[PDB]
Amino acid sequence: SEEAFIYEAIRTPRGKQKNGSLHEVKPLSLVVGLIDELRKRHPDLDENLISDVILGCVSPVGDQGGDIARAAVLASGMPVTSGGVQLNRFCASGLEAVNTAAQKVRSGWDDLVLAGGVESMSRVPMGSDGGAMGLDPATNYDVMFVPQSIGADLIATIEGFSREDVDAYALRSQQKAAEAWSGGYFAKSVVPVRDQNGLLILDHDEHMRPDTTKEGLAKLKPAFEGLAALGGFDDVALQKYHWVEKINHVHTGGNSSGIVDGAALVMIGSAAAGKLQGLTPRARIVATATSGADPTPATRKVLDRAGLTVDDIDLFELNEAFASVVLKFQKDLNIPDEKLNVNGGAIAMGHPLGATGAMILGTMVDELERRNARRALITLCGMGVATIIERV
Amino acid sequence: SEEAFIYEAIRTPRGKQKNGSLHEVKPLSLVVGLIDELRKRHPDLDENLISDVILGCVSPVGDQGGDIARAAVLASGMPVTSGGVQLNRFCASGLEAVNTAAQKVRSGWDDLVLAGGVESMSRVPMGSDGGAMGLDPATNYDVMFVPQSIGADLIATIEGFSREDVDAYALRSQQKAAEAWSGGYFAKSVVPVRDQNGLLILDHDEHMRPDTTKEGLAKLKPAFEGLAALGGFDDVALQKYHWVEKINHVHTGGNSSGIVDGAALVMIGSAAAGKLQGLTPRARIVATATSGADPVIMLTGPTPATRKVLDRAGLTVDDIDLFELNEAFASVVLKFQKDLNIPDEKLNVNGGAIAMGHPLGATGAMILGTMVDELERRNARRALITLCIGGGMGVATIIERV
Amino acid sequence: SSHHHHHHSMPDNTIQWDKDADGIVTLTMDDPSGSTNVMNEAYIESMGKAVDRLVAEKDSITGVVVASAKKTFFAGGDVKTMIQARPEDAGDVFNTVETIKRQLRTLETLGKPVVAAINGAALGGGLEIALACHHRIAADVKGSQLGLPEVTLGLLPGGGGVTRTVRMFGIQNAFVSVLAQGTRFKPAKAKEIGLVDELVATVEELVPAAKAWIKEELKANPDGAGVQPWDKKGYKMPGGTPSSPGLAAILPSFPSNLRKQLKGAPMPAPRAILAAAVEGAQVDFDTASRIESRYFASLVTGQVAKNMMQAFFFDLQAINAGGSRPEGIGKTPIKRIGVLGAGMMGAGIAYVSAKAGYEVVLKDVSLEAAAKGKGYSEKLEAKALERGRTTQERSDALLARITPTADAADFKGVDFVIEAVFENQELKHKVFGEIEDIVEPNAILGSNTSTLPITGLATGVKRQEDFIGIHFFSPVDKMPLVEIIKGEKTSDEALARVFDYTLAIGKTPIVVNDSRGFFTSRVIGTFVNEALAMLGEGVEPASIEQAGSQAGYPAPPLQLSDELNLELMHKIAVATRKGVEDAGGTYQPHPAEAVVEKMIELGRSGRLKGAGFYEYADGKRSGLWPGLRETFKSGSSQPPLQDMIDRMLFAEALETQKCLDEGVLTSTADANIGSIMGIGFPPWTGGSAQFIVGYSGPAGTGKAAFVARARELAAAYGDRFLPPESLLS
């Protein structure tokens, strides 16, 4: 029915895990900081029209428990009718929040919705929420639980990606990320984090290593062979993929996504909601999809749902969880290398689990305007979520 | 654009907290048992058409963490393409999952979706996930955090509901919940819980006390006076509501929602999806809404949301045949009834959480399926489902029988 | 609620009541229907009465002592009853263990100290009775054992063993040390890990030391008397609960490490034990105990438990009770043993014979080779010395019984010969001919041959009544089966002398009639041939090895096909072809034979040559041969994994049925134990004969389902999978 438009898409810088700048900042404060920035960019915005606040969070415990989206509404002083809901779809929680917000606007039963995510992995580590897929032996034994890292090493083994192939993409991400910061591409979207006094805490993605060299990446040791041996997940993965003899462990801390803290916010609304509040639409949600692969289909599904092909997309944005996953995605769909993660990715700047989806979405909204391009496709990785946006 | 239909709506029996039957059953098993029931009801269902599984869970920690919806997909043997997302909007998480699934179906970007919730409060007590609104002093001090318990007693104090009035509604819920069970109203919806051997674990709502009398309710102690003194939440509430001198603590364990374990599942899809899979639509989602009221009172949220969903569907109170509001506290239902002038024969006709229990994340989907069956049993047309939420939120849904 | 099995309107009593002047009750279990105490219906009723009596007289009782009048303390559950439990009997099985544990829980929460007087074996349910007590005293006597070995029978400790061991040691320790493998400890080792608290010299001190401990416990610790550590308010589980941050970090690796150890084999007992332990640690003791009952009921009603109870209880006891041994012969002690050949077989036979305590003469062609054979025993003892298994004085006497030599006259005074030379009928005639006169007149002449018939080998010795086949399996120090082949001129006296010798060295014997291939070598050939045939058909070598491991074999077939030399498999192929062509018939070559010659042509004939299906460097195996995929066009055939698994299991099961039809095997008990302990048939099947009557799949269960599945395999992979007429009707 109604068309969903993106009016704002901001995010915080990503602070590193060890000796990080955002470790002293509560994750609730990361969201309130972005809410106050939206107020500064639109001082005469009737927040009573904001009907929901959807935040993705993969470890909603401790500082991230108790519906952190509702805490953000009350702490920031938003109207008590603005709702607030937390959801969790693992790494795709950030994009699922935006997709859900867009779907709630199409239904007509919601008008103006805030969406995004938050993850303070230095304060609330991954796995702090527990679960059944790992802490219930009967379920773990049956579903054959395997960490994503071993699956990444397995993909590089099946598809034939060498240690130098994944390290080549890691160098590619660090360069394109540094070039994007030096060119000022992120100047208007990355909102520096400050304390209650106004003092600067962080204003850049401090996980980046822009001086990364190909020889330095070769010196790093495989980081996911002490878990595959002591945990025995290698043998578990090969019990299903019985035609593979040995798993080639090629992923290190330099070619994988980084543990960081961050948050993002996207303001999705209808056409009438923007005209009533004087907001200029920056992009338009074309279609969304959800699928899964063998334990790319979500990307193919959103393309058929929007009546498009791979050639019709100007910019592809896939989360750099692991280098082998991107090389696989590029090889399966034959993606032109000059269209894939043009401003770097999680390998260089980090991967805040609950917020990554809304971060890489707002990255394409800016890059579409900077290049004056039309369409962009954002996807995240055994589930999968894909979204297509179009410049307005 | 598209129209969302309810094809199935099942739930587990609610096992009580102390010496509960479901205390040994993991909350993941409760959801799988409901997924297996849908398979038995439709053995030729092409599960590849199911694009997402949305479950509500207020305390997603321990046995309920790590996206329990995705765990239910993998553990039950569903396709890996079937999605799986957990959400948390406090008490209305179960109804928010249903509303979200309906909106994903209307958008045309989803065709067949499972929705519901699960809460094993005996294994995962509420508050286990923590949160800044309670554990962080900076925001707790500013938002003036007060538990739902005190806000309920504050409602009765302002609205003038006596201890006998709230206990009168508690007696009404026990009587109507007993008649519904003895009348066979819950025969097809309540799916008994069994172990890996097929042995019976629970087939009825344990929390019910059908022999409840008004004399027994009057002997109960006010349950929320220990939080009022040791915590000081009485003084915090009266700082915002300064025209009230004293709070009349009228709510006990007999007129408040019970702490139970349970899960619910709802199958929602489009008309084309039901025709492809040979499914008969039972009801149609008319409209949904979200709003709320003051955070300190915390429980007056559903009234602005109920009005919002009536205006969105062009309906009024006279157009609705059945009203279903969660019985979190007796004063909340009595205020909702007085504000909108709800006829007593239309409100919570088959009991509520006071008698049967309130499994937080699943209660929204449980009472949604209760109205789908009662509209079909009475051959009525419309029903309005609403739940009060923590922090002062509210979610409402209007369904129409097909 | 009731301590009894029935509550509506007569077994014999097994417990003797005795209350002393101090108020200490002594419960003495003494089942008059047998020689051991077992959780039968009589025990449940007897213990039900005693527990009801302890409650009715609690004002005059100060302590309880649980003892036994048998040589063993308590032998565990009633296997003869559990094996008959159908899936529809899950309710009766659940209520039975719930009633058994309700009695122990009342004995445990009595408010009075309870001491266990362990006078011998406390296995399975027996240890669970002791674990319900507050203090355990064991008599350090010869033959005493303690443990929870129900995992070896496809079950789990369903009488509180899982719930209490986790409460005492934590999830990780209780599972690894006690539960997962069901190891049996001696009283010295039992006190070290914590299953036993105190030890005494003799059994007469048990009851006095029990009453002495009760008297001291009441005076020293009056408040905590009769209260287990987990029945206290400040109880903290060792290693933490699953909600603890430390344990929750390594907890996801527990099911994966179990799949790594089990190699994906369909064995549900370790999975159920691990699940019951973790799930139980999240709830209170009583709820945890009920979860333990539900997992126990799922295993007993299952088929895998019935297969293991058939093999490792009934079939194994029938063998240990002279089932295959002759009936009239007596005993003949052995003085000095003579081993011919110093290879891995001959050196292994010398070690196990010296480890038992016999004098061994190890003869080879040269003194250099005979010393290198004794060095096999030295490097096993040197490894056992640094690990702490044996002592220095006992290891020096072990090697002192092994006398390496090269002269044939050193066999003077040998009454038991075990030949282990090269597989050649003319050579075995030559080696036996040199010594048949030097040895004692009434001496056993054993031949460790693999395929050559014993009838033909006996023509090289004068007294053929004392000539017999004694087939060991490499490595001899680990493999516990000895296949005793009975020739046509082999007497019954020599059959018993080798039978008693096999029991003397600590191994399990089976009796097999003479036939080319016997039973082990013939059946194990069909298993390796199916894999080699799959390799020739184009199946990925990694999938073939996975199919073998997930089937339940201790070694994947291609890896096993290298330990066995491909030159030997080529010689057996010519022998079978010669026996049919020269008799006036057309030979049907197995498709695996073509793969054997292709590997020999390439110069890869196994680990002995240093190259085979795997690559070998410095003796250590590492990786499949990369040229193996290009040689056989691997990847062009991708059959289902279960089809590969079933092709290996059915090839052995059908061939085992043929050995029973032709009279090669006398009983199915020998077929099961022989397949499990000899050729490594998966224990979850209960043997290659039990696999037919206990088959389970998507089609069904039983012999009918085995036949239908065999025909499904025969329609797509060849008529060799057709069931014999002995299985049809």
Ligand SMILES: CC(C)(COP(=O)(O)OP(=O)(O)OC[C@H]1O[C@@H](n2cnc3c(N)ncnc32)[C@H](O)[C@@H]1OP(=O)(O)O)[C@@H](O)C(=O)NCCC(=O)NCCS
């Ligand atoms: C980041 C991760 C790979 C582990 O990284 P780590 O090893 O702890 O990180 P470090 O930054 O310490 O990297 C290790 C080393 O490589 C170095 N290094 C990292 N990137 C480098 C680069 N580009 N150039 C040079 N050196 C580099 C580090 O400086 C460090 O050196 P050191 O060990 O001497 O200090 C892992 O935690 C992760 O994020 N995996 C994916 C998680 C995921 O996707 N979860 C799923 C959520 S649903």
Ligand SMILES: CC(C)(COP(=O)(O)OP(=O)(O)OC[C@H]1O[C@@H](n2cnc3c(N)ncnc32)[C@H](O)[C@@H]1OP(=O)(O)O)[C@@H](O)C(=O)NCCC(=O)NCCS
């Ligand atoms: C799913 C996907 C990621 C798999 O990647 P892929 O490269 O196509 O994987 P394949 O299925 O070819 O399997 C890879 C290899 O494993 C082999 N293999 C798989 N199972 C095997 C088995 N049992 N034995 C031996 N080899 C096996 C294949 O033959 C292939 O070998 P090859 O690469 O040498 O030819 C990719 O195919 C994809 O994205 N497909 C789209 C799915 C789709 O249409 N979704 C619907 C959206 S609406």
Ligand SMILES: CC(C)(COP(=O)(O)OP(=O)(O)OC[C@H]1O[C@@H](n2cnc3c(N)ncnc32)[C@H](O)[C@@H]1OP(=O)(O)O)[C@@H](O)C(=O)NCCC(=O)NCCS
């Ligand atoms: C459930 C709640 C009332 C606490 O109850 P409680 O104090 O534990 O009390 P119980 O339910 O165990 O009942 C206590 C007594 O009431 C009695 N009782 C309860 N209902 C009765 C009835 N109908 N007739 C007679 N006696 C009754 C019980 O028999 C018991 O007697 P006892 O104390 O002698 O054993 C309170 O925690 C609650 O309402 N929580 C829900 C919060 C909510 O609605 N939402 C939170 C969202 S964040």
